[PDB]
């Protein structure tokens, strides 16, 4: 399912396609205008075309044409059968180059899918003062989380671990400086430590690297 991007908007889709993509690049994503539907976003002629994907509950189609049991069957059909997809009274639209849904960084401090409870246990057991990692937010899909071990090296303290939301909408923490990359945000906060409301300084001293 490389070409599927779970947590993006139509504007994000355009950005990826225009930045990482070439003509013929495409991806699928959830519909924002019609929750439960899906959307095919395709790059052609330097621009991006969005195409509604109907999800009836029983099948998927493009509001016409062939019907499919799964979203992946639909997408694979149109990739495999050049000429089956076209603009009405328009050109054939080629699904040539899938735009893969990639992690926001390759740094080993990024743990991807990891819950707060799971992050607390890893940092508590394998971290020490100032150990940190970044993970996906489970309660805010598309956002990220900086989880940091605080205070002395003891197992018990309140949790030994603080979690700070990183908005992705470009990346910020709580409406401060906006960064073009997660790596850039982490670099910044390593050098200029954030301070929690209640007064602890969150120094990012060493990563707790994934063993994944």
């Amino acid at each position: 399912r490389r070409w599927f991007h779970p947590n993006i908007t139509g504007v994000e889709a355009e950005n990826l396609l225009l930045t990482r993509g070439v003509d013929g690049s495409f991806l699928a994503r959830p519909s924002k205008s019609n929750p439960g539907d899906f959307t095919l976003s395709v790059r052609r002629n330097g621009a991006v075309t969005h195409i509604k994907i109907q999800n009836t509950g029983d099948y998927y189609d493009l509001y016409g044409g062939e019907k499919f049991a799964t979203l992946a069957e639909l997408v694979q059909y149109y990739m495999e059968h050049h000429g089956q997809l076209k603009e009405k009274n328009g050109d054939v639209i080629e699904l040539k180059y899938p735009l893969n849904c990639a992690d926001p960084t390759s740094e080993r401090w990024f743990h991807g899918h990891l819950s707060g409870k799971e992050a607390e246990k890893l940092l508590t057991e394998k971290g020490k003062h100032g150990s940190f990692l970044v993970r996906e937010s489970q309660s805010h899909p598309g956002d990220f989380v900086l989880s940091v071990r605080t205070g002395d090296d003891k197992g018990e303290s309140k949790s030994k671990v603080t979690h700070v939301m990183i908005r992705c909408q470009k990346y910020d923490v709580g409406g401060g400086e906006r960064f073009d990359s997660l790596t850039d945000l982490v670099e910044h906060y390593k050098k200029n430590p954030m301070v929690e409301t209640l007064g602890t300084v969150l120094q990012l001293k060493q990563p707790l690297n994934t063993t994944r």
Binding site: S115, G116, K117, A119, E120, V145, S159, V161, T162, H163, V164, M165, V173, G174, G176, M194, V195, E196, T197, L198, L202
Partner: peptide, 12 residues
């Protein structure tokens, strides 16, 4: 014993 999920902390 109930254990709630960790909360997010405000900063800066």
């Amino acid at each position: 014993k109930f254990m709630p999920p960790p909360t997010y902390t405000e900063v800066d």
